[PDB]
């Protein structure tokens with residue numbers, strides 16, 4: 001069923017809450033035993049948000065291999081994403097270690113460091129060229145190279161150095177800065193513009209490791225980003241784009257990380273973004 005028609009039908013009936021709860025009821029349930037070990041309590045921002053054991057990213061060290069991060073692998077779309085929480089004061093070094101080990105080109109950030117008067121994630125990147133950051137626990141150095149500030153999003157060029165081998169790589173930081181403190185954006189136009197800037201960079205492409213995507217918990221806004229991307233890619237590959245069922249794509253993605261899309265308003269916004277984006281490239 002064409003999703004645009006399904007959209008108007010849910011909107012006229014006002015059943016967004018009922019559709020959303022059916023998703024929550026059908027979603028996969030897999031064990032998260034590593035996340036709940038007592039040695040890992042200060043590695044988790046939220047007690048109710050854990051990576052499944054089968055899909056979790058492992059750090060390459062014998063000490064403790066645990067990070068709150070999952071590999072979302074879409075088989076038919078041929079895209080991989082890492083979804084993670086906003087780093088904590090004691091996990092900033094783990095975060096950059098993961099970026100290095102997985103060969104990521106891009107980091108996508110969908111939150112501000114402070115929202116609603118509270119800290120949502122650590123200041124994990126340098127703000128001035130001449131004041132670089134050293135993570136002594138993981139032996140990495142991070143330098144700000146350049147910064148391009150726009151109305152809806154900032155792009156930064158960073159240099160990550162493995163202090164052990166003296167290899168360096170360029171990492172692109174894509175920071176969406178205007179998601180509101182409450183609710184979802186009224187129009188998906190600036191979110192879709194941001195997604196197409198990440199794509200154009202090469203960060204989502206198979207010659208690199210998976211893109212690292214985060215918000216505060218790594219399930220809500222982060223979920224919106226990868227669901228919209230995958231749905232538009234499927235519409236460009238399939239003989240009939242109207243076959244693309246966003247609820248079925250979301251359930252597949254929820255086999256890899258719990259809780260993706262946190263509210264009925266985030267679900268509605270995901271439909272809006274896919275419907276509008278399909279036009280962006282629909283003999284347009």
Ligand SMILES: FC(F)(F)[C@@H]1CCNCCN1
Pocket residue numbers: 074075076077230234244245248249252
């Ligand atoms: F679930 C499905 F709708 F069947 C597809 C197919 C495969 N790729 C990821 C999600 N979409």
